[PDB]
Amino acid sequence: GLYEIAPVDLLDETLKPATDKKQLSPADRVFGWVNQRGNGCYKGQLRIHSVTCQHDDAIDDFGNQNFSVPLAILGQPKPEQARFYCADDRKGIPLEDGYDRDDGYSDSEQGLR
Amino acid sequence: HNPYNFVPALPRDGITGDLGDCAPAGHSYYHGDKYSGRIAVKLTTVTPLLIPDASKEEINNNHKTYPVRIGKDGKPYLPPTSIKGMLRSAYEAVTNSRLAVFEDHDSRLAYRMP
Amino acid sequence: IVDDAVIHIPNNADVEIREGVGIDRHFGTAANGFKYSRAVIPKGSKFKLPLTFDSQDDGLPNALIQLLCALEAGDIRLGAAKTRGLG
RNA sequence: UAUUGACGACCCCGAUUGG
Incomplete structure (x- = not known):
């Protein structure tokens, strides 16, 4: 089944990615922004540069280059898990325990976590 | 503990001052009331840091292996973009800015009945 | 006299x-409309120096000797975009 | 009335100015 509301519609319009040159929020001004929907862009006020490692032997080769360690299961996120990703209010309140799934993306006064 | 949580993004209606939305300060000159310059920052790792170079990855039975990315002096090379995205997302949190990267999310999600 | 050179x-x-x-x-950021796409001859292309000169008196004019030295020095710029990369 | 079992990867550039 489908939850009755698409997640984008639970997010406040002021929190959505910026859509005009006037509504640029602080991070958008500091780091810069590009409109994903039309004209509009701004070069960030910040540059990171001159990265160096200070040490020399910084790489943990475990002992021989043919070794390689296997590493968990980095599964894809699955926001269908409403009791994890949905918020009971647009302030990000966690959902109540015990209710069915349907309670999830269910009211516009719901929010996202 | 579940290995992820969320910081709550508060709706920013009626946020004023500098935390609110504003026309940008711009690049054309250094403003008398605003600051510019160079900050020196030292990063040191606490848990090990993965920096896989996908350009050097290797495949067996479609299982994938990655070496650590290294720079022209043979030291581990840390992409400044990867520093940037770290800091930006932390900055977006503590400033509670607009969320800079939002994908489709425009169709209803599916679930199953019990 | 300056002939054309291919x-x-x-x-x-x-x-x-x-x-x-x-x-x-x-x-x-890129200013609206202020984009352009200049064609250029790649560096190292060659063409014939196409000069002829008629002297009504003996020898070679001293200033004309200077000009050829300036060409051997490569001091003379040609064509468009002279300030900004080319020529 | 709540049982039936265990598997599986994904994204591959996006938006804009073109005189």
Whole structure:
């Protein structure tokens, strides 16, 4: 089944990615922004540069280059898990325990976590 | 503990001052009331840091292996973009800015009945 | 007298296109409409020096000798975009 | 009335100025 509301519609319009040159929020001004929907862009006020490692032997080769360690299961996120990703209010309140799934993306006064 | 949580993004209606939305300060000159310059920052790792170079990855039975990315002096090379995205997302949190990267999310999600 | 000279672009080579853009000094981004795409002859193309000179008196004019030295020095710029990369 | 079992990868550039 489908939850009755698409997640984008639970997010406040002021929190959505910026859509005009006037509504640029602080991070958008500091780091810069590009409109994903039309004209509009701004070069960030910040540059990171001159990265160096200070040490020399910084790489943990475990002992021989043919070794390689296997590493968990980095599964894809699955926001269908409403009791994890949905918020009971647009302030990000966690959902109540015990209710069915349907309670999830269910009211516009719901929010996202 | 579940290995992820969320910081709550508060709706920013009626946020004023500098935390609110504003026309940008711009690049054309250094403003008398605003600051510019160079900050020196030292990063040191606490848990090990993965920096896989996908350009050097290797495949067996479609299982994938990655070496650590290294720079022209043979030291581990840390992409400044990867520093940037770290800091930006932390900055977006503590400033509670607009969320800079939002994908489709425009169709209803599916679930199953019990 | 200055004849026309055809340019021999070198072997396996063809006209390049440079891109050009204007950067809005406020936003630091490409200014609306201020984009252009200049074609250029690639470096190292050759063409004949096509000069002829008629002297009504003996020798070679001293200033004309200076000009040829300036060409051997490569001090003379030609064509468009002389301030900004080319020529 | 709540049982039936265990598997599986994904994204591959996006938006804009073109005189």
